[PDB]
């Protein structure tokens, strides 16, 4: 029958995992006790996005909206446009599509319209410089996220184009048992519908914290001005620590609210980047879920990924339990032989997933 | 707490700022001869890692991850097995057990490249039952043979080409593309005869849930009043409403003279006015090329030989020729469609 789940927790992942495995699922008791029960508008919008890239999929939403039945179809893709509700940014919808795009019949060319940033969801630069590089390591050679128009909250008005030209049979087996060496720090400090001085003030604040480092700091200033600046003022900064030895990246990002000091935000994000680097062994806590899933759907071989103790949190545990419920795959953790650090090696056997939607 | 919040939890800004005033905690971070031998090194290297990692884990941990490795003697228990299997059990006939990948579970349209076997006497017909053997499974389906028409559309063919491949679409369990298969029309011994039984051979090219086969539908009309380029055509349509839908459509004669549907005539219903690049004759026939969708029949009849008592007399849906003979029906035939010798008188003009 249906593999059952409880609550809205990990809605996107469960829908994504079912699509990759092809196993029908049931998600019930979604916000049963709330004054407004059931799915939110952005969750129904996300389901519509899933159908636009798949064929043959059956999605049934209960009369009260508290239960969802999903019988996945084959991933197809193609060209489409998706209007993101203001409740969530484009990144909330672009993020799950990264799990499905490389394994599609036709190339993913999706135009996302709506707010392009938020405090809780992935930013444009997080996807471009933080997640897409991870995909490139797994064998997704050609993937791009083109920014046409930036839209800051609350009125949004942005436009971004996801293009994943690479279609692959399955991700390459990962083998990283070392702690990457950071060679330099880069980033993008952006602003929309405000003066250029704000962007230069954020970079100053981040440079204050990062100047003590022994590596180069080069933060770009992407000031958006004119018709392509959206409908609301906004600014933000994203800092990416790069390891050119093997092309690995650690990033932190945040946006500015009304009444906030641009200098303070630059200090915070640069200060959060160092915290992220402290907690990381091979990938960031924010890049970890994407890597683990790709290793699960790899070839039937033992891939190895090094992780820190700080990365093993509630989110890491719930992710693994959901994977086992769908894929029956167990992540095996072993200590590293070093005493300088307390890292562990996460070893996962791939299920032998293959892109069967693509014509040969 | 939850993965929907992409950003991870962070401590308060001032606490991190004090923590990262000093960065010393994180300052630590900052030949094979032939290309064939290079690849063979890579597979062997990956196989070695599997064995090393497996050797590390405990036997129970090994069995939990890798599963039962090949060479293992195992007992597998099944439930809800048909009683005919236990009763009509013959040890001579083998029992083959095959694991299924996730694609194999799904049912849908299979698009394949297929040809009639060179030693098979007769060509195959569309919507004519064929027993296929995809993967571990054998079943009877109704395939539709199609052609690309110079890579423009999926047009329905009537029969397989005599001596080459053609695209075939049939409904059944999905399989990974590039999976070969073979087809047979008959499996019962009673009907074997003396001919070769392997009817078709093919390779699966694509899997999908729908297909858009289409068939050429020509609308035929005749002229009844001609004026140089302009002509009035009849019998193409039944009412002036139908003509209005097709105004501006391309039409041509058997001679190849191209034209257009200009306007519908008020009297009589169904007649219309057309303009041709050159004057047409009364003996000409005007044809409008149009395309009509065709649907794959969803017929699935797995070959359950073992369940039967005989195990060699399994019979499913019969061929169209056999059905006609059983009901004593003549093969449908159209006198117009028959070909005849054509003798041409010498062409002279005034």
């Amino acid at each position: 029958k249906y593999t059952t789940f409880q609550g809205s927790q990990n809605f996107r992942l469960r829908i994504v995992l079912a699509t990759l495995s092809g196993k029908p699922i049931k998600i019930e008791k979604i916000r049963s006790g709330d004054l407004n029960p059931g799915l939110k508008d952005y969750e129904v919008s996300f389901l519509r996005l899933i159908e636009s890239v798949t064929n043959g999929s059956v999605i049934e939403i209960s009369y009260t909206g508290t239960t969802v039945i999903y019988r996945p179809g084959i991933i197809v893709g193609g060209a489409s446009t998706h209007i993101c509700p203001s409740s969530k940014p484009v990144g909330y919808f672009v993020e799950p599509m990264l799990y499905l795009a490389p394994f599609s019949k036709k190339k993913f060319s999706i135009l996302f319209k709506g707010i392009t940033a938020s405090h809780n969801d992935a930013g444009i630069e997080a996807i471009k410089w933080g997640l897409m590089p991870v995909m490139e390591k797994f064998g997704v050679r050609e993937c791009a996220l083109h920014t046409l128009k930036r839209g800051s909250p609350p009125l949004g008005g942005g436009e971004v184009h996801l293009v994943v030209d690479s279609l692959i049979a399955q991700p390459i087996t990962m083998h990283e048992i070392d702690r990457p060496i950071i060679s330099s720090i880069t980033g993008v400090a952006y602003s929309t519908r405000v003066s250029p001085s704000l962007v230069n003030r954020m970079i100053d604040g981040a440079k204050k914290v990062l100047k003590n480092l022994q590596c180069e700091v080069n933060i770009t200033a992407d000031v958006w001005r004119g018709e392509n600046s959206g409908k609301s003022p906004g600014w933000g900064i994203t800092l990416v620590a790069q390891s050119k030895q093997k092309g690995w990246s650690y990033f932190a990002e945040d946006i500015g609210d009304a009444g906030s000091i641009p200098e303070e935000l630059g200090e915070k994000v640069a200060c959060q980047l160092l915290e992220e680097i402290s907690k990381s062994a091979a990938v960031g806590r924010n890049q970890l879920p994407l890597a683990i899933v790709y290793m699960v759907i790899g070839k039937e071989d033992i891939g190895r990924l090094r992780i820190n103790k700080e990365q093993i949190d509630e989110r890491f545990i719930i992710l693994l339990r959901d994977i086992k419920k769908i894929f029956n795959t167990e992540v095996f953790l072993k200590p590293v032989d070093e005493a300088d650090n307390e890292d562990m090696i996460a070893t996962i056997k791939g299920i032998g997933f293959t892109n069967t939607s693509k014509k040969i | 707490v939850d993965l929907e919040k992409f950003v991870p939890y962070f401590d308060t800004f001032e606490k991190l700022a004090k923590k990262w005033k000093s960065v010393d905690a994180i300052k630590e971070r900052f030949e094979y001869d032939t290309w064939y031998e290079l690849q063979k090194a890579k597979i062997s290297k990956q196989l070695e890692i599997n064995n090393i990692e497996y050797q590390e884990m405990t036997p129970e941990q090994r069995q939990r991850i890798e599963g039962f490795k090949a060479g293992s003697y195992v007992r597998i228990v099944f439930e809800k097995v048909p009683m005919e299997f236990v009763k009509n059990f013959n040890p001579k006939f083998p029992i083959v057990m095959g694991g299924l990948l996730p694609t194999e579970i799904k049912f849908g349209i299979v698009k394949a490249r297929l040809r009639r076997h060179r030693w098979h006497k007769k060509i195959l017909k569309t919507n004519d039952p064929l027993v296929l053997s995809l993967g571990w499974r054998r079943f009877q389906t109704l395939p539709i043979y199609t052609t690309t028409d110079s890579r423009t559309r999926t047009r329905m063919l009537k029969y397989t080409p005599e001596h080459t491949y053609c695209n075939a679409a049939f409904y059944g369990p999905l399989c990974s593309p590039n999976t070969p298969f073979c087809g047979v029309q008959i499996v019962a011994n009673s009907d074997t005869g003396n001919g070769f039984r392997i009817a078709a051979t093919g390779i699966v090219e694509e899997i999908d849930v729908n297909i858009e086969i289409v068939k050429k539908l020509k609308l035929v009309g005749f002229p009844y009043k001609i004026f140089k380029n302009t002509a009035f055509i009849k019998d193409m349509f039944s009412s002036a409403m139908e003509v209005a839908r097709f105004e501006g459509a391309q039409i041509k004669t058997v001679s190849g003279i191209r034209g257009e549907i200009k306007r519908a005539l008020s009297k009589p219903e169904g007649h219309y006015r057309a303009a041709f690049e050159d004057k047409i004759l009364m003996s000409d026939i005007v044809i409008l090329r149009s395309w009509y969708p065709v649907r794959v029949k969803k017929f699935y009849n797995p070959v359950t030989s073992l369940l039967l008592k005989e195990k060699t007399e399994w019979k499913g849906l019969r061929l169209t020729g056999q059905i006609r003979a059983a009901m004593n029906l003549e093969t449908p035939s159209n006198p117009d469609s028959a070909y005849h010798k054509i003798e041409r008188v010498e062409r002279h003009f005034n």
Binding site: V44, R48, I59, E60, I61, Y63, G65 | N210
Partner: peptide
């Protein structure tokens, strides 16, 4: 043109 080549569909009974 959206309906031409689709077989599934979200069945919202709310």
């Amino acid at each position: 043109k959206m309906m031409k080549n689709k077989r599934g569909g979200v069945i919202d009974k709310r």
